[PDB]
Amino acid sequence: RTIVVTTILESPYVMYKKNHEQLEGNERYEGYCVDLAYEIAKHVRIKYKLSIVGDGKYGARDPETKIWNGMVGELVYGRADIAVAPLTITLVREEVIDFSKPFMSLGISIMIKKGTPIESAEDLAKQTEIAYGTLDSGSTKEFFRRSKIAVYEKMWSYMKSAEPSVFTKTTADGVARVRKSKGKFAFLLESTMNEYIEQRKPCDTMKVGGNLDSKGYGVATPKGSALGTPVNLAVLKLSEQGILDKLKNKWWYDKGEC
Amino acid sequence: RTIVVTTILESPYVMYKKNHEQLEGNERYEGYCVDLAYEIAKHVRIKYKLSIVGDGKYGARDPETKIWNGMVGELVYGRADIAVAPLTITLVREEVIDFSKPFMSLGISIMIKKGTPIESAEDLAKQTEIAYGTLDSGSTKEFFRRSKIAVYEKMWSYMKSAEPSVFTKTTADGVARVRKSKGKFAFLLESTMNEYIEQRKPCDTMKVGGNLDSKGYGVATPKGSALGTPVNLAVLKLSEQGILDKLKNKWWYDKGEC
Numbered sequence: 082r083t084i085v086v087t088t089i090l091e092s093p094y095v096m097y098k099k100n101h102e103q104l105e106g107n108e109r110y111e112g113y114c115v116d117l118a119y120e121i122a123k124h125v126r127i128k129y130k131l132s133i134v135g136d137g138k139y140g141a142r143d144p145e146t147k148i149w150n151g152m153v154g155e156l157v158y159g160r161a162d163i164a165v166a167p168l169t170i171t172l173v174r175e176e177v178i179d180f181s182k183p184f185m186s187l188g189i190s191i192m193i194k195k196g197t198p199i200e201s202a203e204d205l206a207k208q209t210e211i212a213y214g215t216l217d218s219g220s221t222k223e224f225f226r227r228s229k230i231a232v233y234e235k236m237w238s239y240m241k242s243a244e245p246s247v248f249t250k251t252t253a254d255g256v257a258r259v260r261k262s263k264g265k266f267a268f269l270l271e272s273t274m275n276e277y278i279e280q281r282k283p284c285d286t287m288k289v290g291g292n293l294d295s296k297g298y299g300v301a302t303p304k305g306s307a308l309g310t311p312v313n314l315a316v317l318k319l320s321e322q323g324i325l326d327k328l329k330n331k332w333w334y335d336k337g338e339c
Numbered sequence: 340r341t342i343v344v345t346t347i348l349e350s351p352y353v354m355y356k357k358n359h360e361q362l363e364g365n366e367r368y369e370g371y372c373v374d375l376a377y378e379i380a381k382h383v384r385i386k387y388k389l390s391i392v393g394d395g396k397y398g399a400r401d402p403e404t405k406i407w408n409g410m411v412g413e414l415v416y417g418r419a420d421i422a423v424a425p426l427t428i429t430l431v432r433e434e435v436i437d438f439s440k441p442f443m444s445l446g447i448s449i450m451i452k453k454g455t456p457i458e459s460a461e462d463l464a465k466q467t468e469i470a471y472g473t474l475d476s477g478s479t480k481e482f483f484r485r486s487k488i489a490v491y492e493k494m495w496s497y498m499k500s501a502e503p504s505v506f507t508k509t510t511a512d513g514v515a516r517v518r519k520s521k522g523k524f525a526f527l528l529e530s531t532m533n534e535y536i537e538q539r540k541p542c543d544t545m546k547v548g549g550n551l552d553s554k555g556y557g558v559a560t561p562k563g564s565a566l567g568t569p570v571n572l573a574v575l576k577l578s579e580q581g582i583l584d585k586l587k588n589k590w591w592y593d594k595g596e597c
């Protein structure tokens with residue numbers, strides 16, 4: 082009856098409210114994906130509880146054990162009914178779960194500390210003074226690992242071998258490292274997170290260049306689920322009523338500090 | 340065995356080749372969607388024939404007869420196996436056919452003759468010296484007809500009553516009218532077509548402002564079809580190998596005359 086909605090902490094998708102320790106259930110959280118889940122559940126007519134995925138991951142299949150981890154795995158093993166999170170719609174994920182049409186459009190992009198002499202991936206690639214890396218795991222690393230475009234192969238090889246490690250564990254950590262490296266570290270991350278950070282104090286970062294690819298986040302459900310279709314139509318309706326635009330503006334720009 | 344792929348003439352998606360009258364079958368045509376259909380059919384492993392939809396329409400349901408027209412209707416009535424066209428992924432369409440994940444991202448946008456004093460929808464809305472309209476039918480008209488955002492309601496009402504008619508029958512006609520109206524007509528059309536035209540002689544138009552919405556084109560198949568899933572994974576794979584980016588650059592920018 083009460084559906085399980087798996088999600089994950091990632092600003093401004095899902096964040097603890099100010100006095101979350103005094104709160105219970107869904108009231109503990111706020112953010113874009115909290116509002117989205119509310120709006121979706123309103124259209125599909127379901128009661129639900131948000132659960133933070135236990136292992137803090139998005140969804141990948143271990144090559145050895147073949148187990149899917151993260152929110153994807155919660156869905157694959159039947160421990161959750163829906164995942165509402167900045168979950169990149171990728172082929173390997175689409176093979177084992179169902180994604181709604183994108184609720185947000187995005188692309189891989191470059192974050193620099195203001196003043197860094199870099200405008201594009203090409204600038205990064207033809208040098209090593211300024212180091213650069215992606216998150217340790219996730220779709221961006223995967224984009225680079227799999228590319229057959231020369232510029233991107235060049236970048237993957239560099240990152241793959243760079244010492245010490247150019248990869249970071251979280252968005253926060255990548256941002257901290259740009260911010261501390263005095264212009265000697267650029268972070269490669271989804272354009273959505275990049276744009277959000279740009280609008281946050283100390284306002285010392287910026288997104289430069291166009292995106293490297295074009296993709297989307299989708300709401301995910303287990304294959305064969307009876308919520309699959311209604312959730313899909315819910316996203317499209319929300320997109321069409323301008324609610325997805327309204328929410329993005331709310332969480333990214335209305336609150337903008339720069 | 341040989342699957343029917345319904346499509347439609349619309350530059351640079353599908354166009355007659357130079358000597359099409361001397362050619363047969365699929366060889367008559369070229370463009371982005373011709374290349375896409377080739378690439379998809381290669382991954383899904385099917386032989387196919389491109390058929391130009393008979394009634395020159397995309398897909399809407401007549402309110403009186405309840406018949407679906409256009410490429411959508413070819414799919415709904417079983418006369419075609421797949422539609423590969425700049426077919427906007429919309430809720431009313433998604434209710435009766437299956438769309439792949441978007442192969443192209445886009446939004447409603449503004450086309451002006453160079454020099455026109457207009458930067459945004461707001462500028463258009465607060466005046467009448469410069470007339471403006473959309474295609475007679477299609478998803479853009481529908482966006483305006485259904486909006487509950489004030490600026491857009493204002494624009495729909497104006498367009499709805501403007502004399503003579505601000506609506507045009509085709510992309511070509513809308514472009515011609517901008518081009519001839521000496522800065523007194525702006526055309527509201529999908530950002531994809533807008534960007535393509537901007538790169539064509541006489542180079543006297545331009546896209547101004549951001550887009551009014553965010554959506555995509557999807558490849559469409561009948562509900563319950565066994566090609567639905569493989570086509571969906573085909574688009575994602577192509578997106579992921581950078582083939583959709585390569586094709587867009589090919590048909591929009593490589594050939595750019597401005």
Ligand SMILES: C=C(C)[C@H]1CN[C@H](C(=O)O)[C@H]1CC(=O)O
Pocket residue numbers: 091139167168169216218219220221222252269270271
């Ligand atoms: C925040 C993380 C780790 C997620 C969010 N979208 C990607 C995902 O769905 O894999 C990841 C980021 C990226 O790989 O840059």
Ligand SMILES: C=C(C)[C@H]1CN[C@H](C(=O)O)[C@H]1CC(=O)O
Pocket residue numbers: 349397425426427474476477478479480510527528529
């Ligand atoms: C070219 C046309 C009439 C099509 C293409 N995409 C929209 C569709 O799928 O409805 C239409 C354009 C638009 O309404 O501005």
Ligand SMILES: [Zn+2]
Pocket residue numbers: 097
């Ligand atoms: Zn706390």
Ligand SMILES: [Zn+2]
Pocket residue numbers: 355
């Ligand atoms: Zn001809």
